[PDB]
Design a protein around this nucleic acid. Structure first.
Ligand SMILES: Nc1ncnc2c1ncn2[C@@H]1O[C@H](COP(=O)(O)OP(=O)(O)NP(=O)(O)O)[C@@H](O)[C@H]1O
Ligand SMILES: Nc1ncnc2c1ncn2[C@@H]1O[C@H](COP(=O)(O)OP(=O)(O)NP(=O)(O)O)[C@@H](O)[C@H]1O
Ligand code: SF4
Ligand code: SF4
Ligand SMILES: [Mg+2]
Ligand SMILES: [Mg+2]
Ligand SMILES: [Mg+2]
Ligand SMILES: [Mg+2]
Ligand SMILES: [Mg+2]
Ligand SMILES: [Mg+2]
Ligand SMILES: [Mg+2]
Ligand SMILES: [Mg+2]
Ligand SMILES: [Mg+2]
Ligand SMILES: [Mg+2]
Ligand SMILES: [Mg+2]
Ligand SMILES: [Mg+2]
Ligand SMILES: [Mg+2]
Ligand SMILES: [Mg+2]
Ligand SMILES: [Mg+2]
Ligand SMILES: [Mg+2]
Ligand SMILES: [Mg+2]
Lengths: 178, 96, 241, 582, 126
RNA sequence: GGUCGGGUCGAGUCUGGGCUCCGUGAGGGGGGAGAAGUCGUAACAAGGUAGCCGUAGGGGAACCUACGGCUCGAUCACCUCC
RNA sequence: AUUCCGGUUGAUCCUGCCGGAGGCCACUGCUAUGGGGGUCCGACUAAGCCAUGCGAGUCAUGGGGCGCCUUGCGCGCACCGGCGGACGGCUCAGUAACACGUCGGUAACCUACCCUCGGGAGGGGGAUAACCCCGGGAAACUGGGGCUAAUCCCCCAUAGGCCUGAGGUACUGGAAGGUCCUCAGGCCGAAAGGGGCUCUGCCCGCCCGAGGAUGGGCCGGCGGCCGAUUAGGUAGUUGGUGGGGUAACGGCCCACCAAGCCGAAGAUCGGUACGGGCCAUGAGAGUGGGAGCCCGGAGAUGGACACUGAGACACGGGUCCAGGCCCUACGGGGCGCAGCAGGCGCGAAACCUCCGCAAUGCGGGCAACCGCGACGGGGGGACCCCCAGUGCCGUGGCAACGCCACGGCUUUUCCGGAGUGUAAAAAGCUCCGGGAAUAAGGGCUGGGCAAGGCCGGUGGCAGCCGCCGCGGUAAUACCGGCGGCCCGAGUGGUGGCCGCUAUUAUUGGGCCUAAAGCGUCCGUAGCCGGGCCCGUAAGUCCCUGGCGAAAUCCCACGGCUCAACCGUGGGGCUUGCU
């Protein structure tokens, strides 16, 4: 009767709702996602945050206070909330905020990639460093403290400013919503 | 798994008019005869007698009969270790 | 089925060992010895995992057979030897001594100490037989046994503690179980907690007696008398935590 | 191809309701696969040509009388080697077993020599296409996952110093000079020449030269060469050919005393020495000239009895419809020839050979019989004495068999005769069919099995209509059913032509089966060959066996002969009674 | 009787079906019938669970008899009044509650001669 | 250790009595679909004898008759409550 | 996401069932690039049968020998002797039971190895392997004679052990049939002062006793399926007296006394089933499952019985019956894979007859070390899970969501190579070189249900159809082309469980006409019960002590690139019991 590793993403209750399909199609094009699986993964992350917040609203002390503090400091660390935040703000959060904390998206920002799809390729081909560490997982959620340490790899041609694609990417220095 | 005894045809209920093809099949684990429907268009021609055939459920509501086929509970799936869908669509010719 | 157990699976191991339960399949099954399985850990785990003087059991066994680790002043060459609560593990080549004591989490740890205290071992008396020769055998919680005489048989009582000079086994400083006695808990919920005794309740039949204990910060908590280990009259005098 | 078989001891057609026939799909669909019969006691019979397996009858029979067996097939496997696009194929190889001695029993034409060459590195498998010219690499890559992978890895990395005694002793004879002593001291690397001599009884021939050697003397030499060579793997392809009973016993003893921590593989047709000499024996089954599959290990006595009964009870294969049987049953005179080839005096003590009766020739390995046949064919002329009537149409077949002709079998038999292949002939329908050469007509000869070749030379020799046939070592390289078939062929042709035949061999089964008289050679091997008048069968056998002090016991219900251990109760009894070979 | 395990019946009366075979440790042994012998006191030695030892008396002679702390070895004559069984007084078999006619008179046994291998008895005052 | 016995736990082996279980299987029964068929027209409108329940008897078949009940009965003629 | 949608009519509202839509498990079609992690892989049918090999050995510091080193030192070899082989490993047949879980008990018991303490090691004697001579027997196996040792065996005594009786009351305990002291009578009755060194000391050892520990045995309270178309069951059965037996209490067994015990709150009987921790599902309540990891139990073809040992009624030991198979010289002998691999067979349904003791551990050993199909390492496999790939950038064009061309880039993956990695290897990791090459399907396309007023073929045929329903010459519903939608290295089919289902309803359903109020009454158990006062404090609530293993679950923090995974800690879980 043992453990049996379970999925960390939830699929929708109905597969063919026009509203959900349209919404997800838009998100997937905006954020350049390969998989509904990937999207639903981040949705499930959010859902678990929300459920914890709910429980801790409807909870009592000495524990469920610890977990309140832990939830809030985790979300601060991830960059989803400010330090002065609350469970009300958890419930205000969105999957878009999560996807904005992906690495692919921050690299489309930080003017490093010119396109989320090219950001994906840079990550996967090994041209992005986070705190000196090569990361190749574009779904990696960046911490708000690691965000300012994102850079091309030292062993990357894109780190040579003479590189053609680097020159194009910096011909278009842009950021903001991603 | 079963041995095809004979190839037959069954009349659709009342409003529909068609002769649904099927086979009487002797199952090996118990020696019991059940009738199975052969989906596809030339499936009954791709199937021959004394052939080993694999027997699924036909679907149907209570593990039972399906559609205008009154009293058939089973589907043919493989014929002499080859899928009937591929035989019907031409690919993967039959061994025997 | 047909007989005794010679093995132990690392998941089925004691909860008080600091063992890394999922890394391998097997664990050292302790030998019978001084203490119990619930209040002990094997010397291999002490030499290899706790102190880190070996990454491997072959190295550890070489060490132990060379004779570099004492347990209460005695060389112990077996890797399955039980090392228990309030035990002194000495390494002279390194000049280190450790007291095996429990944690607040309930697990066994090594508290570093020096030579002076390292020549001391407190022993809860835990029983008292009358043996042939009309002599008194004190039956102590490390499974040890000390013989005394019918003169001080009354100075010696069951729940008391005896400080013992261990490479020689000479009693010094009997510490009685009384009110005001400084105590160190060894098991339960209030594990690595200490204070002065306040009260004792008796509970008619085989229900164990219970002691009420006052900590340093004035708090006041109960536990079992058998789990209440006396370390001092008014001060622990054995450098506990 | 799985079918059904009935036990007929558990079958009770009365107390059954005949559930088998009733719950058969084929009988129900109209065909016939099971049906009653008066060929048996009103009991059912199963026609394999129609049964599809499926076991309904098995699990409907109340008295669990029906079982499913397996028939072999040229369909399913991972073919290891194909010689030719339509010639022959092989499924599986046996693994050579670090320290044990492995036997490989099989039949004629099924893949023994082929297995051995694959394991010896002589040839590469070429799993499918005889073409594709790819060896060593892709073979290893394809055998990945197995333990034979390790074997071949070492073999092709030449991390083992394999030897190989080959099936064609004359093709080996051609490639060495000197005499035995310097041959052996030159080839040795282990220092056991004395031991080898004492075992294989090579004292007399210790100074004779290789070219003038008898068949078995030469065999002993090659076997000794192989033994003395140091290696990790030791392959012996039919090391019992041209030998006599005692010498092949000694040979087995030598092998299993001097090779005791080496991989050893042994192909041999002699069940006696395989019972001895083998720890395990793989069986090779199939259809001669078509396909061969290897079996499981099958310890020696079990493997033998299984090979004899057909059935192998680990693959659940019926490899033969029926069992081996072990059946039971003047025109020229001369003077007492004396002959002398440098040394080895020979005296023969004349006979009569009435009509077409067969004359066997028995004796040790090293006295006459080949000199004698050579004299009769006239290759050598006697120091004294001669045959009468001389100048008679003659044929011959020596023990110098090896592949030389470059044409095919149809040509061979053509230039031999017309009766060899004219289906007109009783000769054809008796010999060439029962020998199964119609399946080898379009096969070149230099690529044949030892037994197919032997059968061919015998066929030619008996197709040449004559009055004096002479066949030396005809049973060599042959299995047991073929031994008996060949014997029947000889007897048939000889009694049809009313001629003489002089069979030399070391197979008392053959001599007992056909020989209506025999001739025994006595004397010191290689020094003196003293034959005698033709003697009746049992007497000459008993004398030939009283010499060498060997004894045989035949099972009654089959007839399988087996040698009795020296000193055994039955040896002593059979000796003090004089009933050698009962 | 051999097997001294559980009974095959519940107090309700229902049947028990043994879920296990019988273990060596839940067996018994054939009983000692400590009879009176003519002479040559007879005993055997039983190796028991743990390698422990029992002395099983089969023919007793002497019967150490006791009165108020004083004992003596007094040569059993015979058996009378076994409350355990009347066949025992017939067969002259000794047990713990038995009465024995002896030198120095009647004595009630206090030992278990099948276990301890000795007969110890107590004088009855009359 | 054998050979005689005398006790015991004792599987099994023959058998007779029951009790079910299973594999079959003559010959009777009804049931469900279907096919168009055959005899009639029972029921739904007062369905052309109002229908239905219970019991009983009878009848090719739906069904009929009797006694007691019900309206889940239509219509027109009364008194009454609305 | 605490959800709905389609279907009874000419239309409507209901009831109600079917179906869709979700997740998981197993088989399965088509398809398939990579890596990592993990408690996955002959469990479902056959606890059916098994070819081969391996899975338990170690000690030369117990003993005498045989051999090799020219000998010394030393090396090897078996044999006797010890220790172990009763663990581990596999399977789930049987079992509805103190088997399991949990709380407790054993003052009613055993325990080799281990620890502590306290003591002791005295005096004799003997045999027999190995070896030597001869063998027998087909084998399996086995005989006779000679010779020899021991940490082998026997004896004697001293200690000690057990019983009983008397009395003293020193010990512990909640409580003495216990321990201890003195005296009596008895029965049983040890030991290796052995071996090695740096030898006059040290090390490893032998026996007894007291305790402990370890591991078990036994007892009890509570707790957890179905059936009344199973209602009475039990005869040593319930109890007692006395015994025997057992390690130990016990009707466990016996003799003798009595008539109890269980049961409608369901006994007995039958059916099914290893139990649990856990798992799946679901908003939860709940429903369901209980192969894989841990704990316990049981079993080793079926059945029964014993030896030896601390421990077995003994998976790799013994004996018999039944049943089957193998070898045989027909006299006899041997085997039962539910160990790892591998096969037969069964089936819809599951891998290599690999490598290594390097880790973890076990056993042996003074130790070094040796062995271990445990374990580890690999490989095979659409087992689960995590991370990714099948290109990206510009310009220009298009039937512009995307494609095509022209130029540029990158190289995760592919190819090759070097280092590290590894027990060795492989993978992985770092680096070099080459090059957009080397890499996308499956289903659906009338509505449920996202997606075609397109085309060609067939023409109530063929066919589809989960349900509704389409199809009889203009078919968006079959087949095909083009297109499009969903998911995507996966996607579909079949079966099963949960959900849907407030179609089992405690939460939370209904019973005039839809399924459903006994024909009516009376009453036993059961359940529900007016108001005040007093008490108790059983339920109930609070607080506190001891337990309810670990893993699993939640959370944070750390380490493998992140993750999965692992660790640290906090919490929860176990129905709870006390
Ligand atoms: N080089 C070859 N080329 C083509 N065919 C061959 C070759 N060698 C053997 N064959 C055929 O393959 C079949 C079996 O091969 P082979 O291994 O030689 O038989 P075998 O087992 O040795 N029999 P035997 O030697 O008679 O005991 C024979 O019939 C040959 O005709
Ligand atoms: N040319 C020769 N010169 C001298 N001696 C010869 C010659 N040929 C044969 N021999 C010897 O003659 C003796 C017997 O010869 P041969 O008849 O060929 O052997 P065999 O008895 O048939 N043994 P085998 O063939 O193995 O069954 C052998 O010792 C030969 O060495
Ligand atoms: S095999 Fe069975 S069914 Fe066939 S005849 Fe024999 S008993 Fe009858
Ligand atoms: S196996 Fe099947 S087909 Fe073959 S004989 Fe038996 S019943 Fe007939
Ligand atoms: Mg050959
Ligand atoms: Mg010759
Ligand atoms: Mg009417
Ligand atoms: Mg009418
Ligand atoms: Mg009417
Ligand atoms: Mg009428
Ligand atoms: Mg609807
Ligand atoms: Mg199975
Ligand atoms: Mg399993
Ligand atoms: Mg003595
Ligand atoms: Mg079961
Ligand atoms: Mg079996
Ligand atoms: Mg599978
Ligand atoms: Mg559709
Ligand atoms: Mg319902
Ligand atoms: Mg309802
Ligand atoms: Mg837990």
């Amino acid at each position: 009767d043992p453990k049996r590793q379970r999925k960390k993403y939830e699929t929708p209750s109905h597969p063919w709702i026009k509203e959900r399909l349209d919404r997800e199609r838009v998100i997937m094009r905006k954020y350049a996602l390969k998989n509904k699986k990937e999207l639903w993964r981040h949705e499930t992350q959010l859902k678990e945050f929300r459920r914890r917040a709910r429980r801790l609203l409807a909870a009592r002390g000495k524990q469920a206070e610890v977990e309140r503090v832990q939830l809030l400091q985790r979300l601060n660390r991830l960059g989803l909330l400010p330090a002065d935040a609350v469970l009300d703000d958890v419930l205000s959060l969105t999957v878009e905020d999560v996807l904005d904390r992906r690495l692919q998206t921050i690299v489309y920002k930080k003017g490093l990639a010119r396109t989320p799809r090219q950001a994906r390729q840079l990550i996967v081909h090994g041209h992005i460093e986070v705190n000196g560490q090569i990361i190749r997982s574009p779904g990696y959620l960046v911490l708000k403290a690691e965000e300012d340490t994102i850079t091309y790899s030292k062993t990357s041609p894109f780190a040579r400013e003479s590189h053609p694609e680097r020159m194009v990417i910096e011909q278009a220095k842009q950021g903001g919503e991603a | 798994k079963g041995i095809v005894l004979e190839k037959i045809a069954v009349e659709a209920k009342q409003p529909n008019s068609a002769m649904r093809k099927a086979v009487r099949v002797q199952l090996i684990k118990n020696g019991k005869v059940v009738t199975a429907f052969t989906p596809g268009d030339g499936a009954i021609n791709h199937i021959d007698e004394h052939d080993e055939v694999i027997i699924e459920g036909i679907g149907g509501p209570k593990g039972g009969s399906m559609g205008d086929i009154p009293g058939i509970r089973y589907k043919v799936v493989k014929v002499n270790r080859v899928s009937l869908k591929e035989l019907v669509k031409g690919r993967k010719e039959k061994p025997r | 089925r047909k007989g005794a157990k010679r093995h132990l699976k690392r998941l089925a191991a004691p909860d008080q060992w600091y063992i890394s339960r999922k890394r391998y399949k097997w664990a050292v099954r302790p030998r019978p010895g001084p203490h119990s399985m619930k209040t002990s850990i094997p010397l291999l785990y002490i030499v290899r995992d706790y102190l880190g003087y070996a990454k491997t059991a072959r190295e550890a066994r070489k060490i132990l057979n060379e004779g570099r680790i004492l347990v209460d002043g005695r060389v112990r060459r077996d890797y399955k030897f039980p090392v228990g609560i309030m035990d002194v593990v000495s390494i002279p080549e390194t000049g280190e001594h450790y007291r095996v004591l429990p944690n607040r989490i309930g697990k066994l740890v090594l508290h570093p100490i020096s030579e002076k205290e390292a020549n001391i071992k407190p022993l809860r008396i835990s029983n008292k037989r009358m043996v042939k020769g009309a002599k008194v055998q004190l039956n102590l919680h490390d499974g040890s046994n000390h013989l005394v005489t019918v003169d001080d048989k009354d100075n010696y009582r069951t729940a008391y503690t005896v400080l013992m000079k261990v490479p020689d086994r000479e009693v010094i400083e009997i510490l009685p179980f009384d009110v005001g006695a400084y105590v160190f808990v060894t098991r339960g919920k209030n594990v690595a907690r200490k204070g002065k005794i306040v009260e004792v309740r008796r509970f008619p039949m085989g229900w164990p007696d219970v002691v009420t204990i006052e900590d340093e910060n004035g708090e006041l908590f109960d536990t079992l008398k058998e789990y209440a280990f006396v370390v001092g009259k008014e001060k622990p005098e054995i450098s506990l935590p | 191809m799985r079918v059904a078989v009935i036990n007929y001891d558990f079958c009770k057609p009365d107390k059954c309701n005949l559930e088998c026939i009733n719950f058969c799909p084929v009988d129900r669909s109209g065909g016939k696969a099971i049906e009653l019969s008066e060929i048996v006691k009103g009991k059912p019979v199963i026609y394999e040509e129609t049964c599809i397996g499926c076991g309904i009858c098995v699990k409907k029979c109340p008295y669990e009388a029906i079982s499913i067996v397996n028939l072999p097939d040229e369909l399913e496997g991972e073919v290891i080697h194909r010689y030719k696009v339509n010639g022959f194929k092989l499924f599986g190889l046996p693994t050579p077993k670090n320290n044990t001695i492995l036997g490989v029993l099989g039949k004629n034409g099924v893949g023994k020599t082929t297995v051995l060459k694959i394991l010896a590195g002589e040839i590469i498998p070429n799993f499918g296409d005889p073409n594709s010219k790819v060896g060593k690499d892709e073979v290893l890559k394809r055998f990945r996952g197995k333990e034979i992978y390790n074997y071949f890895k070492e073999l092709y990395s030449n991390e083992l110093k394999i030897v190989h005694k080959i099936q064609y002793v004359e093709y080996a004879s051609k490639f060495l000079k000197g005499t035995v002593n310097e041959i052996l001291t030159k080839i040795d690397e282990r220092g056991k020449k004395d031991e080898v001599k004492e075992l294989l009884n090579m004292t007399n021939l210790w100074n004779k030269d290789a070219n003038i050697l008898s068949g078995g003397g030469l065999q002993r030499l090659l076997v000794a060469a192989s033994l003395l060579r140091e290696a990790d793997v030791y392959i012996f392809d039919a090391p019992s050919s041209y030998l006599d009973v005692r010498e092949r016993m000694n040979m087995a003893k030598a092998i299993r005393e001097l090779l005791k921590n080496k991989y050893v593989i042994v192909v041999d047709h002699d069940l006696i020495v395989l019972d001895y000499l083998t720890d395990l024996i793989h069986i090779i089954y199939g259809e001669s000239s078509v396909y061969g599959r290897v079996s499981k290990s099958y310890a020696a006595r079990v493997g033998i009895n299984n090979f004899l009964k057909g059935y192998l009870p680990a693959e659940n294969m019926k490899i033969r419809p029926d069992e081996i049987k072990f059946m039971l049953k003047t025109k020229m005179k001369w003077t007492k020839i004396i002959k002398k080839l440098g040394d080895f005096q020979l005296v023969v003590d004349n006979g009569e050979a009435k009509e077409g009766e067969i004359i066997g020739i028995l004796g040790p390995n090293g006295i006459g019989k080949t000199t004698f046949a050579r004299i009769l064919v006239g290759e050598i002329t006697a120091d004294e004495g001669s045959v009468t009537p001389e100048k008679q149409i003659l044929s011959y077949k020596p023990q110098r068999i090896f592949p030389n002709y470059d044409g095919t079998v149809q040509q061979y038999l053509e230039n031999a005769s017309k009766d060899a292949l004219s289906t007109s002939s009783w000769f054809f329908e008796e010999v060439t069919k029962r020998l199964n050469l119609h399946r080898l007509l379009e096969s070149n000869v230099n690529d044949l099995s030892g037994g197919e070749l032997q059968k061919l030379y015998i066929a030619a020799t008996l197709a040449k209509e004559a009055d004096l046939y002479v066949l030396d070592a005809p049973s060599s390289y042959l299995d047991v059913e073929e031994r008996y078939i060949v014997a029947k062929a000889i007897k048939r042709v000889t009694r049809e032509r009313k001629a003489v035949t002089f069979i030399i061999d070391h197979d008392l089964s053959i001599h007992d089966y056909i020989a209506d008289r025999i001739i025994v050679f006595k004397g010191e091997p290689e020094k003196a060959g003293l034959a005698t008048s033709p003697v009746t069968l049992k007497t000459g056998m008993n004398e030939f066996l009283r010499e060498l002090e060997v004894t045989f016991r035949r099972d009654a219900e089959t007839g399988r002969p087996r040698v009795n251990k020296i000193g055994s109760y039955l040896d002593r009894v059979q000796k003090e009674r004089g009933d050698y070979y009962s | 009787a051999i097997w001294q395990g559980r009974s095959l019946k519940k107090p309700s009366g229902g049947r028990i079906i043994l879920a296990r075979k019988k273990r060596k440790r839940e067996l018994g042994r054939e009983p000692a019938f400590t009879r009176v012998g003519e002479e040559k006191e007879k005993k055997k030695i039983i190796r028991t669970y743990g390698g422990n030892r029992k002395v099983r008396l089969i023919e007793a002679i002497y019967a150490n008899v006791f009165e108020n702390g004083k004992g003596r070895k007094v040569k059993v004559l015979g058996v009378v009044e076994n409350p355990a069984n009347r066949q025992y007084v017939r067969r002259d078999i000794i047990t713990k509650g038995a009465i024995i006619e002896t030198e120095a008179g009647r004595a009630i046994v206090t030992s278990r001669p099948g276990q301890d291998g000795v007969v110890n008895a107590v004088l009855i005052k009359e």
